[PDB]
Amino acid sequence: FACKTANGTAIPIGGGSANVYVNLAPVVNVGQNLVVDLSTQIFCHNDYPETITDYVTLQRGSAYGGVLSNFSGTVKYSGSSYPFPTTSETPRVVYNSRTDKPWPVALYLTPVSSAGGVAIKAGSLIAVLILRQTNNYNSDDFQFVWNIYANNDVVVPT
């Protein structure tokens, strides 16, 4: 089991960490969602689907910088919605193919009432997402840590 980003940055068998740089909607009004769709950014696969089933969770997700200060968060994992920053490990998604499959994570971030102006700064860390991988084969229990950075400012009109 291993993962890679849209630009080809890989985390190999056994886990590790990688940076993900995302473009963000430049203007987000109070009442609207800023959507960070990581399912277009992070892809994983099973290296031995003939014999092994891989299990994958969002073990936890943390918010940083402007997202922590200025937004109210929800994370969607494989179609189900949870608080973000997270309060529990998600159910498992099965990886049973050698063909790359998206990691089905999306953040839905809406401005808090106090938000206004540059609510997320270009280049800032906005989230850390921990992908936890196990299997039905051995005792492997690996973390793939995704550090999410903003490519641009996000402005909340006042």
Ligand SMILES: CCCCCCCO[C@H]1O[C@H](CO)[C@@H](O)[C@H](O)[C@@H]1O
């Ligand atoms: C003849 C024995 C072959 C043994 C292949 C084990 C390969 O293990 C890797 O790939 C497995 C399948 O993706 C993962 O479950 C495991 O954690 C690791 O990433």
